[PDB]
Amino acid sequence: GKKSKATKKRLAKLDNQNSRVPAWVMLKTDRRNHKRRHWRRNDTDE
Amino acid sequence: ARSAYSYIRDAWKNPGDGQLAELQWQRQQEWRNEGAVERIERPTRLDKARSQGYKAKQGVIVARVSVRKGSARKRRHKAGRRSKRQGVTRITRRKDIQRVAEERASRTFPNLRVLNSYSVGQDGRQKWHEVILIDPNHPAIQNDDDLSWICADDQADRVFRGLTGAGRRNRGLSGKGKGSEKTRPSLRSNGGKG
């Protein structure tokens, strides 16, 4: 499949959203990413 | 003494008699080749126009509109309906042809507001009406004492809300007493029984 520049920016954002909650937030909040998406298990838009 | 206007009026009492009979037979031939909504520089019935609110001023536009004669252009039921609701041929619309004309005109002129309208005859298959429209944004109207009321925000889209004279008459608002129980203050406030 041939993706456009806008589609590429969106996929790029979704890849970044797929990172975990950093070590320091856990300590700052005294203690989970609910938007964890897998390439196989979950489906993205478009 | 009689006004010159009273002669245009007396002529239109019988549009199938005299010199007007000959005039209509001629005009309608050009009108049939004209569009749905046609802007005319001067009103065909000067007396009626002036009586309805027209003035030879800047921002006072007039236009002729042709609408089809007859009942509703209805489709037959595609689903189940009881006998009463199975009609097509005898069903008529609740808005008169004049009101259909005023709306078609107002849509053609999205900036202008409908003042009033009048009939200018009919042939075998269509009816013609001339609608007087006003520019609520021209200072020639914003300063005119006899017309500046139409510039107010609550007069916007007056024809689509039935605030025209032809609108109010069609809504059953003529009589102030008996018969107007289900019509005044509005049809929608009375449950739609008028």
Binding site: - | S3, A4, Y7, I8, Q19, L20, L23
Partner: protein, 119 residues
């Protein structure tokens, strides 16, 4: 055209519009169809002018029969703008009236006679 039953020659019209220009500077003239109608009704009309290019024709339609039932003579002018300038206005006029002429009474009298001879 529905009210026009006789064609007025280009020269007879010139004689008429010249008589109107000197009628305003001496006696009195009425400008506009309403004022023309009230002249024929009050009898104060000597010679009434009517334009041929009036759209709509209803505004003027009545003048030929109204003049014929009041004895008042009438004449046709081709253009609306020429009659208006003749009455002394920047804007055109559909109809004008000569209410008591002046130093044109001899000309107006002959024009009224020339039109009757033209039927």
């Amino acid at each position: 055209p529905v009210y026009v039953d006789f064609d007025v020659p280009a020269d007879l019209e010139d004689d008429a519009l010249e008589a109107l220009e000197v009628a305003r500077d001496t006696g009195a003239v009425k400008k506009g169809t309403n004022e023309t109608t009230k002249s024929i009704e009050r009898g104060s009309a000597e010679l009434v002018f009517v334009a041929e290019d009036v759209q709509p024709e209803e505004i003027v339609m009545h003048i030929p029969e109204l003049a014929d039932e009041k004895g008042v003579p009438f004449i046709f002018v081709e253009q609306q703008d020429d009659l208006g300038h003749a009455a002394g206005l920047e804007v055109g006029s559909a109809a004008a009236a000569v209410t008591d002429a002046g130093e044109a009474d001899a000309d107006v009298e002959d024009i009224a006679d020339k039109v009757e001879e033209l039927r």
